[PDB]
């Protein structure tokens with residue numbers, strides 16, 4: 004546009020595909036990372052079904068679709084279907100050719116080595132990308148919120164990651180990975196829903212569970228005191244008319260499921276709560292470096308949007324943590340797009356040149372170019 | 379009479395849509411504020427304890443100073 | 447068809463009153479909560495000011511103690 | 515040009531008088547008193563003279579680059595902003611000042627308080643106002659039109675006088691923004707005639723949704739103080755840039771000739787060379803403009819003209835000419851560069867100006883034309899300053915400002931709520947969407963400045 008040339012920003016997860024044009028502050032066309040076929044055989048003739056039904060077109064009509072998700076936190080059940088997800092991204096919504104503008108993707112911390120080389124194969128050899136990089140999830144948001152000294156816990160629907168990044172990344176481990184977010188809460192509901200004459204059976208309607216979840220479901224401050232309150236039918240049940248037509252008086256259902264977050268013992272996992280793992284990462288660093296970590300805590304992700312998420316942390320942390328200085332948690336009121344706001348940062352930096360992979364660089368160091376320069 | 383009823387029905391549904399829309403925005407406004415009120419209430423109670431603790435520790439420090 | 451039109455007019459006119467009624471009650475509930483929310487917000491701030499003072503006084507007493 | 519051109523037309527010798535009477539006119543707009551030089555204008559203007567089919571002027575348009583838009587609210591002690599403002603406050607009657615919403619009390623305001631100076635013995639205030647009116651009336655701005663314009667300016671003054679206080683919303687030491695001096699922020703919404711509260715719900719708090727359709731404003735984020743004062747400035751400063759452009763352009767609408775068309779010729783005019791015993795951020799950007807002016811000649815009187823040697827068919831042999839000094843150009847364009855690393859440090863929100871300095875030394879201190887107190891042992895350089903070479907000398911800059919002085923970018927999340935109103939003043943601040951300058955609206959500063967400087971170059975490598 005008579006400014007520069009070849010530039011773009013993108014970001015994908017287990018919820019939405021955040022992307023936009025060149026030099027933007029906020030996304031432009033986010034869409035669900037879904038994709039399925041036809042369990043209904045799509046009037047076979049009222050088109051040769053194909054196109055699994057990805058994008059707004061897919062999210063619109065769920066019934067015909069057997070929504071089979073490709074990338075469940077880390078593991079990619081299949082790469083063949085990924086081919087026609089990015090074919091919908093750059094060409095339909097972004098309206099730009101990938102054989103021109105760079106690309107800034109996100110990296111699920113500690114992702115299988117074999118996956119990186121596989122992805123690069125899809126871009127460089129097929130979609131011809133002469134410049135691109137895959138930054139590491141959390142570290143991005145750090146520079147956006149305006150923090151240089153804090154501990155980041157960025158996670159939404161993908162995977163939980165405790166990234167103590169306030170003066171260095173890639174160093175002692177002090178990081179954790181937990182497959183317990185988003186889809187885990189989306190699949191657990193139908194189970195407990197059975198006791199209330201409800202059952203979102205198939206995957207298509209399972210996706211709706213998440214929709215209603217993010218508009219009412221809240222977290223209990225103390226399950227004990229709210230157990231006796233159950234008698235008082237006022238703060239619990241609330242009339243929610245299902246778009247089709249079937250009221251669901253969610254009440255105790257709201258604060259029962261989220262309890263699993265702090266208590267992973269409800270789904271057969273010894274994984275400690277997100278406030279225990281926090282200790283595990285802090286106890287590794289030096290002794291004279293905790294007082295500043297407690298001062299500011301970066302809690303990001305769409306998972307940190309439900310009522311009663313930050314106040315609970317300040318109750319459990321103080322217990323098994325030093326009690327002398329003040330403790331404050333920085334949870335950006337809109338901390339979901341924290342990664343994208345940070346993506347816009349690195350997207351406009353020139354120092355970033357010493358990170359991405361140039362067309363020729365791949366052929367000069369084989370497929371291992373990724374893990375030979377990056378880390 | 380049918381034509382007259384149809385005319386009244388057309389404007390009736392229009393007013394109905396407007397009424398429901400106003401109620402939908404009103405119930406939402408009351409909802410979000412109610413949630414904020416609860417968040418403020420919890421923040422008020424937790425600080426109410428800190429305030430007392432901050433006062434007692436001050437009085438204790440004074441008594442401690444009187445002894446020495 | 448007239449019977450159907452009249453029937454729809456009845457349920458529409460009634461639902462219209464209910465929708466308007468709910469809009470008023472929802473706004474009514476919004477107002478009473480909004481007022482309390484503002485009162486709490488104000489009260490909370492006044493305590494925070496006292497909270498700081500209480501701490502500074504407590505610390506001052508400690509520093510004054512160390513001297514003696 | 516004239517005489518050699520043509521004559522006859524009685525409307526030709528008359529317009530030859532108004533353009534000569536434009537000297538006192540141009541001596542008010544562009545010119546502004548500095549600490550040292552009195553007639554030290556400060557702007558990047560490129561005036562275009564249009565002509566007719568016989569060879570005489572008909573009109574023209576005006577173009578300006580990125581404005582030193584901080585001049586209105588912030589400046590060095592002793593200096594002053596544009597004259598047109600101060601000459602208005604002391605030229606009108608208290609009766610009219612009340613209509614504007616002004617009170618007889620300079621310290622009461624903020625923008626004027628930050629300076630700490632109003633009445634000056636040298637310049638006469640009441641005597642200039644009547645002269646300004648003549649200038650406006652002589653051109654084509656009757657009192658009826660003047661009043662219509664003052665409402666727009668007076669509106670900005672209301673939205674200007676609001677440096678919000680500490681908002682005890684947080685818990686520990688940090689804080690957000692909230693109004694304590696309400697009547698001031700109320701004045702901002704007074705001219706707008708909208709819910710005073712609702713106004714601050716969309717501004718101080720950043721709302722974003724988007725996806726599928728396009729955006730839904732209501733849920734938002736109480737930003738920190740740095741980003742708070744940032745939007746405060748970005749807002750109060752952008753409105754003036756749009757105003758000036760629309761001010762000079764809408765004036766031409768009356769002056770411009772409709773009787774006939776013709777070609778176009780451009781003319782350049784810019785600030786002057788000033789050097790204090792001290793320096794600051796503003797000195798860097800001004801000197802940067804000169805770096806282009808020097809490069810301009812090099813690209814023209816040294817390069818373009820040199821190509822004319824072989825075009826005229828002359829036995830020419832390449833003679834050694836001093837390098838194209840690309841050490842000061844390549845060092846600030848392609849990846850790994852000054853302005854390239856400048857945007858790198860600025861976007862690291864937490865990183866202050868002090869830290870930015872260290873980001874330069876490590877990347878360079880080897881490429882010619884850059885030194886410091888660490889490498890170059892020279893006591894003249896402070897511990898919080900740095901050395902930079904230009905043409906033939908040395909200049910040591912300060913670090914004060916930079917941050918809020920540079921970025922200044924303004925997003926469309928603060929404009930949408932305002933341009934949705936219904937008033938020739940409110941929406942008037944935002945002319946009929948995109949005055950031939952948009953393409954893509956939301957871009958983090960850095961690039962935005964490049965446009966003002968790139969649009970300048972692109973139109974130089976294609977003309978005589």
Ligand SMILES: Nc1ncnc2c1ncn2[C@@H]1O[C@H](COP(=O)(O)OP(=O)(O)O)[C@@H](O)[C@H]1O
Pocket residue numbers: 015016017018019158159160161162185213216217218304305306308309339
């Ligand atoms: N305000 C909100 N309240 C509750 N859930 C939200 C909110 N905003 C976004 N979400 C949810 O957060 C998820 C996306 O979070 P994100 O951190 O981007 O996930 P991922 O990185 O795993 O793709 C989606 O399930 C979305 O519905």
Ligand SMILES: [Ca+2]
Pocket residue numbers: 015016017109111140161162
């Ligand atoms: Ca992810």
